[PDB]
C-alpha cells in the first residue's frame, strides 16, 4: 500500500542524554525515523525531557509509552501515561503509538486538537501466534474503527508459513499498515515490507538494542539485504535450512544481484517442514532456493524435475521455479564445488553421508578413486555400495600416508567450534584435508590438520564455487566468478555471525 517502507530505529537508552545520542546515531546509520520508548527511561521529567528530544532529534519522532500489560515497561497511573502521549503531540511529535485496548478513549480525548503534521498509530501485539486471515481482517477493522491514522499489527511466528498471512494483510488492506511477525521464523516479514505494502519496519542501532525478537540492524537492512531496492516486482530467493542463521548466502547473492542490477532479493529461510514451506510459498514471487542442512534429500523429492546429476547423486541444493508452468527444478552445485576445490588444493576418505557427503562421494568416484565414514553406519554403508566404495566413525581414528580427508558433517560448525570428526593423531596420514563447514572458516579440524603438516582446503572455497553456479541458475546470467570471490573476501570474512 502506497510508499516504500520506512526504516524506524527503536530508542531505549535509560536516560534522556543517551537517547539524544542514539537519535543522532540513527541518523548517521540511515534510519528514516526513531521510536522513543519512553517506558525505558529510568528518570523521566515529561515536559522537560520531551521538549529536549523533539528539539535535538535530527529525525522525525514517534513516541511510545508502553505499559506492562502490553509487553512494555511502564507501571502506574493510566491517565498520567496518556497525558504524556498527548503532551508529546502538543510539543511537535510526528507520531505516537497508542494501544488498541485504549485507542478509542485516547483518540476521543484529542478530537479536533491534532496538529497538521501528526499521525496516530494504533497497535496490537500477539505474543502467541499469527491468526487466520479471517481473524487478522477483524483485527484490522477493529483498529480502523478507533480512528487510527495507521494500523499496526505484530504477531508471532510459530512456523515460517505464518508470514504469508501477514504479507496478504499488508499487501491488500486499504489503510496504511505496519505488519510485522516476531521471532527468527518471522524475519522475512521485516525485510520484504516494500514488496508487500508494509508502511514501516524496525531496524536496530546495533545487535544488542533489540525491542522485539527477530529485528535486524539498520546496517544489514540497507547494505546486506539492499532494502531500498526491494519493490513490488522484485523476485524473492532464499537459503532453506535448520539451523540457517549462520548462512552467508544472503551476503553474497544480494551483493551480486545489486552489482548486475538484477531485480531480486535473497533472505534466510528457517524451515521446519520442507513440504509445507514449498506449498505455502508457491507463487511466482518466490523464484528459487538454495538448500542446506538438513533438507538436501527432501528437496530432491519435492522437485517436479531433477537434473541428471542431482538424480544420480541423490541430493538437491538448488531449486528453481520455472515461470512457464510454475514447477520446481532441482540441481546440485555441491559436487563441482567440493571436487574442484579439492583438486585445486592438490583414495578419498569422506566423513559424513548426508546431502554434502553424497555429492562429494559421487564426484570423488567420477574422478577415479572412496571410503565413507559416518556416525550412522548404515548410511555410510548404503552410500559405499551406491558408488562402489563403508567405515565406522570410530574406526576412522586408527584407519596409506598420502590420503585425502573430506569432512561433510556439521561437526565443528558454529557454535560447536570445538567438535572435530577425527583425532589429530590420524591426520599425519593424510596429504590434504578438506572441510565443508565454512562457518567458521577455520574449524578445529582444519586447524589440527594444518598442525599435522597437511595441506588444507577450507569450506569457503567450496562455498564460493557452488554459489556462483547457483547465481547462473537463478538469473540466467553468466556466473560472475571473479566477482563472487571479491564479494566473499570483502563482505563475507567476519566470524561468529548469526542472522536471526
Ligand atoms: N561450504 C559449502 O559449500 C557447503 C556445502 C554443503 C554442506 N556444507 C556444510 O556441511 C554440513 C552438512 O550439510 P548437509 O546438508 O550434508 O547435512 P545432512 O544433514 O545433509 O549432513 C549432516 C551430516 O552430519 C550429521 N551429524 C550431526 N552431528 C554429527 C556428529 N556429531 N557426528 C557425525 N555426524 C553428525 C549426520 O550424521 P548422521 O548421518 O549419523 O545423522 C551427517 O553425516 C553443514 O554444516 C554445512 O554447512 C558446506
Ligand atoms: O548458505 C549456505 O550455508 C549454503 C550451504 C550449502 O549447503 C550450499 O549447498 C547451499 O547452496 C548454501
UniProtKB/Swiss-Prot annotation:
Parts of the chain that traverse the membrane: none
EC number(s) on file: 4.2.1.10, 1.1.1.25
Coiled coil regions, renumbered to chain: none
Keyword NADP: yes
Reactions performed catalytically: 3-dehydroquinate = 3-dehydroshikimate + H2O; shikimate + NADP(+) = 3-dehydroshikimate + NADPH + H(+)
Residue sites binding NADP(+) per the record: 353, 355-356, 374, 376, 379, 413, 436, 459
Stretch list, region 3-dehydroquinate dehydratase: 7-224
Segments of this protein annotated with the region Shikimate dehydrogenase: 239-446
InterPro entries: Aldolase_TIM, Aminoacid_DH-like_N_sf, DHquinase_I, NAD(P)-bd_dom_sf, SDH_C, Shikimate_DH, Shikimate_DH-bd_N, Shikimate_DH_fam
GO biological process: amino acid biosynthetic process; aromatic amino acid family biosynthetic process; chorismate biosynthetic process; embryo development ending in seed dormancy; shikimate metabolic process
The keyword Transit peptide is assigned to this record: yes
Key words of the record: Amino-acid biosynthesis, Aromatic amino acid biosynthesis, Chloroplast, Lyase, Multifunctional enzyme, NADP, Oxidoreductase, Plastid, Transit peptide
Top-level taxon of the source organism: Eukaryota
Amino acids binding 3-dehydroshikimate: 35, 37, 66, 152, 190, 211, 215
Subcellular location, record wording: Plastid, Chloroplast
Residues annotated to bind shikimate: 247, 249, 292, 296, 317, 334, 438, 466, 470
Annotated Pfam families: DHquinase_I (PF01487), SDH_C (PF18317), Shikimate_DH (PF01488), Shikimate_dh_N (PF08501)
Biochemical pathway: Metabolic intermediate biosynthesis; chorismate biosynthesis; chorismate from D-erythrose 4-phosphate and phosphoenolpyruvate: step 3/7; Metabolic intermediate biosynthesis; chorismate biosynthesis; chorismate from D-erythrose 4-phosphate and phosphoenolpyruvate: step 4/7
GO cellular component labels: chloroplast; chloroplast stroma
Residue positions of the active site: 125 (proton acceptor), 152 (schiff-base intermediate with substrate), 296 (for shikimate dehydrogenase activity), 334 (for shikimate dehydrogenase activity)
Family that this chain belongs to: In the N-terminal section; belongs to the type-I 3-dehydroquinase family.
Subunit structure: Monomer.
Role played: Bifunctional dehydroquinate dehydratase-shikimate dehydrogenase enzyme that catalyzes two steps in the chorismate biosynthesis pathway.
Name of this protein: Bifunctional 3-dehydroquinate dehydratase/shikimate dehydrogenase, chloroplastic
Organism: Arabidopsis thaliana (Mouse-ear cress)
